[PDB]
Amino acid sequence: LTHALYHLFKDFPGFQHHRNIEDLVERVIQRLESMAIRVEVDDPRLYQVALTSSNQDEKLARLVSELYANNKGSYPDIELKEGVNFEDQIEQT
Amino acid sequence: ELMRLSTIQHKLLFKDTALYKENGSFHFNDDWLNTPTVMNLATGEIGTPEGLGIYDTAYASITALKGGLQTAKILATTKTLILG
Amino acid sequence: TLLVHGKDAQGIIKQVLSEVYDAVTSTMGPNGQLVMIKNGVSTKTTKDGVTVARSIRFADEAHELVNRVITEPATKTDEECGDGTTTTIMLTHALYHLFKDFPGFQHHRNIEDLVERVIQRLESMAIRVEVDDPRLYQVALTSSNQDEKLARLVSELYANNKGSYPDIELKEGVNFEDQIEQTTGRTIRMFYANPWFAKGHQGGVTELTGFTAFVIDRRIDKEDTQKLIDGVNHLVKTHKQHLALPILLIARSFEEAANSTLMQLNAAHPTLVEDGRPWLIPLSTPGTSELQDIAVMLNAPMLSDVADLTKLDTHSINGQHGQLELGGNRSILKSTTPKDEDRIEQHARGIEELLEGFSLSDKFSVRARYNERRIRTLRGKLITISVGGETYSEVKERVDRYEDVVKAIRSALENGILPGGGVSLVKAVFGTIKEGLEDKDQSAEFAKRYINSGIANELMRLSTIQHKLLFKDTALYKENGSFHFNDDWLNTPTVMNLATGEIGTPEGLGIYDTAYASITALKGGLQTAKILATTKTLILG
Amino acid sequence: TLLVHGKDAQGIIKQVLSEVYDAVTSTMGPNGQLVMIKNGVSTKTTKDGVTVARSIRFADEAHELVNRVITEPATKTDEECGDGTTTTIMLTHALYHLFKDFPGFQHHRNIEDLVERVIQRLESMAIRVEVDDPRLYQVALTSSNQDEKLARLVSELYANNKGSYPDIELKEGVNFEDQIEQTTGRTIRMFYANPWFAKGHQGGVTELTGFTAFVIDRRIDKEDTQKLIDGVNHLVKTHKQHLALPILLIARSFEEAANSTLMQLNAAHPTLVEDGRPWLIPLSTPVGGAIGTSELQDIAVMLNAPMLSDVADLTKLDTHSINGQHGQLELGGNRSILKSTTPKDEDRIEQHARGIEELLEGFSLSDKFSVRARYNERRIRTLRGKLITISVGGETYSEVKERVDRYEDVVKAIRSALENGILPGGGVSLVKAVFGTIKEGLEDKDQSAEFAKRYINSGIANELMRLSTIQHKLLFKDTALYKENGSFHFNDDWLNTPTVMNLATGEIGTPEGLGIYDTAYASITALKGGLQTAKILATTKTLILG
Amino acid sequence: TLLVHGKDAQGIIKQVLSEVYDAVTSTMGPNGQLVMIKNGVSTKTTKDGVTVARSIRFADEAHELVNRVITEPATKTDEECGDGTTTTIMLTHALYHLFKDFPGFQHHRNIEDLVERVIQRLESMAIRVEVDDPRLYQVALTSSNQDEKLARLVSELYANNKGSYPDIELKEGVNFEDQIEQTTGRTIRMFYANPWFAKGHQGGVTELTGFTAFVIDRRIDKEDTQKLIDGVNHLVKTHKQHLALPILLIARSFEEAANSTLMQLNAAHPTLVEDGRPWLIPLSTPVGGAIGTSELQDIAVMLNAPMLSDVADLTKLDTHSINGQHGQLELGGNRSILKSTTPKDEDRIEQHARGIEELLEGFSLSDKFSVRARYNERRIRTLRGKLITISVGGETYSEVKERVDRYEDVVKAIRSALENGILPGGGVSLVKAVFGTIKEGLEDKDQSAEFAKRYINSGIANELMRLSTIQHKLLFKDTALYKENGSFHFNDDWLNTPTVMNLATGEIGTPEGLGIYDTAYASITALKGGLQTAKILATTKTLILG
């Protein structure tokens, strides 16, 4: 965006144009801040983000999403350790 | 000119694919704002980001525009470099 | 020799087009700079767009090869109209950047199509000015470099002669004041084949009060020498009773082999010689239908072959008793009887009826304009102005300034008038965008091709270029960084008279351009831009 | 001078071929670029493959030496057909890389034999179009650079004259509109043996209104000098009463020994000379062979001349054999032109034309596509052909002469279309030929054992399939065929129903459906000539500059 | 420093890959050239692919930057297996040219999937050789550079010990002849957690004649520090009577937080210290996963140690659970070695070994070739393996150490032959795998539609066939296979009965007939690693030197 907006300033030179650019871009920023979806803990959209980030893992995206969803009221801090078994083991405290 | 700049990211992501296939370059309209068009690179399908599942973090995209604006303005308005 | 291919050829093209642009554009406006051209051991200092363009040279063969494509089509080929050379180079540069900005064959077929629709609007927007209309003075004032005396005189010459279009010639006079010579006579394109056939046998001005003309079509050489001997002796022997001397043999071209034969044929019959005057004169013309006009004026029959002179009769042969003035440069008719003027006017109406039944696009073509040139020859008066001044150099410069005024006013009445100051192109672009977008039938297609692409918006920015160069560094571009057009400005445009120093409408102030010049600039600018954009290879061998 | 041997010669050859390839191929396609050629103190800007190829020069002698081998055979020698120069240079480049990839004399003899079988498939695949068939319009439209007016007019001229094949000449007109002049006149392949026998004694265009022709078969040299003296003086003395001057001695060839004898024979009888015109004219015809014998028989029938085997047969003649015509003939250094033909003569010509037609009616279907049938059709067309002179017009001088050239391209295209044939355009006919030849050899179980070892297992067959694609690629890259993936690939199904793109309209379909065609002779000769030049370049190891 | 972007980056990568290819490939074949390497003030002259690869250097930083990506993955990281470095560079160069020839992300995702299916065929094709099978001699003969004496001796050592897999060490001898020392002793995968716990407190080789081992499963860190203090002090106080020092705490991993605690616990009881030897030693094993759990069970059975899940289980113990051995053990930083095993202990080990064997007896034929069965076999071999020390001799000093290396190559080859597998050598197995995969996909009528579109019609399938030939070409060029024509070409029949040449003898036959074999693990890993490095090089566009 730096590269993009740098060309916009060189394309409309002079101080009078600059104050117009800066004001319009500022109003765009106020739209993105309004368009933003502040997602809640219970909301099932987290699964879609989890499914994308885990390289299409059906098992992992379900478990981590449930860990957040079940604890409705407290934001869980997660630590990871190299286990021993084939299966995973969870220790909630 | 500002409308042309917003396209830059969508261009770099989905150039050399089946969105820019019918003509020389893909162009947005009034209808595409209600139901956007992308491409899932893993699967190979065309749809809406809401449908397919492509999302970004809001704070990252917002701060990119704010920080991009300030650094752009400085570079545009600099006329002197002191190396001493 | 070397062969240039790829990014390098497109690199050369861009550089040459840039340098030509800068040199030619700086000439325009109130801060119009001056160009200093070397010729031999002298110095010519001017601000004439054409003269600058004609004289730009480059050292490199590659650079010069390109230079002959951007200047020379509007420089060497453009001999009939000098004006609109600055404008063509200007639009070429503009439209070149438009083609580079939207690459690929699919965009190009869209650009070429929209620009073609803009051309159709300008051809419609043209105001067909009348002879009596006072607007001609405003056009005369602008073209004469703000001359109050000259613009008044030339405007009056056309205004006073309401009904006939005056042909104006210029000669270098002797006095300080100007002298006008008005004559009610027609000018013909025929002239002597050889100086021997004139009065005094040395290319003089032969005046006649009777003749019998014959118009041949073919170019005459050594092959037609026998056909002339058979032809001439047939009329002199058989049809001498109904024959007024001299016999005028009008044709396309007379070669020296044929001219020498016709000299001896004059000597063959010495009885018909009156006061030195030869009774047979060959006459050449520099376009088949121009000889048809020549035939109608002098009651002459049209003949395809030279051998057709034998098979003739009293019905075909018609000897006139008017008044003609033959010349080495041109021939001049004077005395035309009411019987002859009926034949000329009827023939003129026949050409006019052909122009009435053509399309609007073909009215601005070479076909229609040549047919109008036919009419004006068939119905025109001759005026000879002898231009004067204080020195020798001041006279010949004033001669050129008169010639620019004549060329401007002729083309003003002929072709049309459009609002000057880079306004007619802005109105045409903004008009065509709005028309296509507002028309709900094709609005779906129009938006996809031009509007959503950004072609429509980029084309609006181009039309502004001329208005910018004319009125930058002035009180229009004072309020903000740059002046921007709106919806309201199309109805009532805004310019500045540089002579006075006032703001108003081109209609109010009086700034106009010739329509044919501005239209040809856009047509020729589009073609040359497209070629330059699409060239990838230069061959120097 | 210098002598280049080894890896450097092959180094230069590769570079020059590369540069010429790039310049000439960039001309092709919808994104067809433009070449800006310098000539004197002017600039010619064009996209014509032949004009680009003719004008490429190099500074180094070694580079220029090679340049005359790749361009000049399809440039300087190719005078009859202008089209198929971009095709030849393209195929040369492709096949050169095929010879380099499979080196050694054993592979080379296998490449040459497979390409030879592809050539045999193209000649089989050729569609012989008829005069009435509307496909000619599509050929006319493509060759005219998408002209709606010109393609309609020229296609009508051939279609309206159903029975006679029109010969079209072009002249620079005067008006804005075009003007057509139709004349019932024939073109003959006879021409002057020596310039002396013409009007003005310097190879001029002699016009005649009466003659007495005699057709000899033999090639005439120093051995027949005595037979001519006995022959000519027999007719001039005995049979002068029933003889219209001049006497035309039509033959195969007149050598300079015989021509000098007949010059003196004209001087022997000065009484029969009228206005400079020699009363005896020898006339040669470029034919050769016993196929070529029957063209003189056509010449004999047109002018009511007797067919004579020997020169000594001129002595034994009579009023029944000798027939002096009183029509109109125009002799020329390039060709002779007949004009005035009486109704009595046209009965003899049409009867002789029917005799050739009846021979074609009683042959097999396979032999109708042969050289024998097509030559016999060329005989008919000469015997029933009309002269048309079109005077092309326009707005300026330059627009006229450019339109003249655009007319000439359309005439050349339609002539060769009816003459030779039609193939599906868009680089499709070569793909169908290769993919056909490989499938035929592999499927044929008799020679499948040998065919697999030579072509299939080697990878020659597979590499040859990739080369046929080259033309189709250059035309339809950067368009909606190459959109779904990185590159378009042909399959088994596409051979039955091919896929192209009409660049004017913007639609996808079959060449048969849309209407894109090429002349068969151009595409066939390009493959033949491209193969030969490729072989030479690949096999050159030495350059001598002295 | 400089930044390289665009066509220059791909320009450098192409050049460095070319030079490394030329330098390493020239080593292979009967006309196998020799490389002369400078080291200090001496000269090493060799035809060893790995040693050539490790030693190639460049002057420019950009060049050396690229050079570390092509060599170093199969050079510095590959410490366990030296063989298959020439092969990996070879395939990298081949597969790089494939990725350049079919550019674009859609083609690339297809190439990667096809090569993946070739890999699956090679893993299926592998012949699992048995100990008694005479084929091992052919493998030994090829790996020893045609040594008749050595290949006989090493093959006999494995063949005579039918039941136990011998571990072989090598030492520089004194005599001209070799001397063999056979010992009934086991090698264990346990080693020191910290160097402090060894003899001399600096990671020495501690020899013992009595111990009491305890096997823990968990990975030990700062969390288990309290559990160790409670555990160790419980046994030292309560169960001291039936305890032979030292106490060995075998586990998965000991972190530095736990090691420092156990150092202080040794200092807590100074009465139990004998001649410097610490009475408590933590011992780690590199396993991981639930497959890896059962290796500690083998460790437990060998030393009569109880299996413990938690560290806190050390408290709840008794005379029935605690068992102190009085054998002989040799602890080490690399590995531990058992020696003295009483007849009572060998009964327990053999009974446990039979339990693993019985599990393998009751599985399907397909699962016998899996990772599960082969790991369970690796368990048995550790539980029943004997130590052999060969002292290699010769005429000089240099001839001995060279013969030591030649022995080590033969041992590595025979170990991996029995372990992983055997494939037909001479670049035959790759050609069989590719031609197999294409034929299987094309012949299978279900997916034939998709398979033809992606691979066959594209020309990927055919281009991949040409690559597999590369190894066979380098080996048997300039010989009587490539004699009849310019180049040898494979067919359908040659897949059933392949054709090579024995370079020692000079005869033509099948690899099965003549006796040319390769280790399966080396050939598979070369294809896997060659594909990954090839992809990276083809898709790199930028070099940062700062």
Author numbering:
A (entry chain M): 94 to 186
B (entry chain M): 466 to 549
C (entry chain G): 4 to 289, 295 to 549
D (entry chain A), E (entry chain L): 4 to 549
Which statements did the authors publish about this structure?
Our structural and functional analysis of the chaperonin ɸEL from the bacteriophage EL of P. aeruginosa revealed that the protein is ATPase active and functions in aggregation prevention of denatured proteins. ɸEL forms tetradecameric double ring complexes, which dissociate into a population of single rings in the presence of ATP and at physiological salt concentration. As anticipated, the ɸEL subunits displayed the typical three-domain architecture of chaperonins, composed of an equatorial domain (residues 2–130 and 425–552), an intermediate domain (residues 131–188 and 388–424), and an apical domain (residues 189–387). The domain structures of ɸEL differ from those of GroEL by numerous insertions and deletions, which alter the putative substrate-binding cleft and the contacts at the ring-ring interface. Our functional data rather suggests that the chaperone mechanism of ɸEL is encapsulation independent, and represents an evolutionary precursor of the more complex encapsulation mechanisms used by the group I and II chaperonins.
To obtain the solution structure of apo-ɸEL, we next performed cryo-EM and single particle analysis. Symmetry-free 3D class averaging indicated a tetradecameric double-ring structure with C2 symmetry. Refinement of the particles resulted in a density map at 3.45 Å resolution, which allowed construction of an atomic model. Apo-ɸEL has an open structure with a ring opening diameter at the apical domains of ~65 Å. In the apo-state, ɸEL is a double ring with six of the seven subunits per ring assuming alternating states (conformations II and III) and one subunit in conformation I. The putative SP binding sites in the apical domains of subunits A, C and E are partially occluded. In all subunits of ɸEL the tip of the αA-β2 loop in the equatorial domain is moved away from the nucleotide binding site as in chains B and D of crystal form II. Other nucleotide binding elements such as the P-loop (residues 79–86) and the β17-β18 hairpin (residues 503–512) are also moved outward (~1.5 Å) in the apo structure. These local conformational changes might facilitate ATP-binding. Similar to group II chaperonins and unlike the staggered subunit contacts in group I, the ring-ring interface of apo-ɸEL is formed by two-fold symmetrical contacts between subunits.
